[PDB]
């Protein structure tokens, strides 16, 4: 028989399997982009809907 989910019944349980990152995930460099705004404002095609 398959194990009853712990939240399904009213007993407390103090040994449980927590998933974890192996190390801090904010450690890396932040993303950065190269925005390059349009050559001529009058030439911009805002149409097409």
């Amino acid at each position: 028989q398959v194990g009853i989910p712990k939240l399904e019944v009213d007993h407390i349980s103090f040994s449980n399997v927590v998933s974890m990152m192996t190390a801090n995930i904010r450690t890396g460099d932040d993303m950065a982009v190269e925005r390059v705004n349009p050559d001529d404002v009058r030439a911009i095609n805002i149409r097409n809907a």
Partner: protein, 49 residues
């Protein structure tokens, strides 16, 4: 003898600086006549032609 190239250029002595024209680069070029608007600072130059 020894002339390397002979070109037919617009005449500087007639199309003088008094008329605004600058023939030094092989084309006429007048400064603030038909300037484009809405563009980056170096982008006026072709209109000078």
């Amino acid at each position: 003898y020894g002339a390397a190239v002979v070109n037919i250029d617009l005449n500087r002595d007639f199309f003088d600086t008094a008329t605004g024209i600058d023939l030094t680069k092989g084309i006429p070029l007048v400064q603030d006549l038909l300037v484009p608007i809405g563009v980056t600072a170096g982008a006026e130059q072709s209109a000078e032609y």
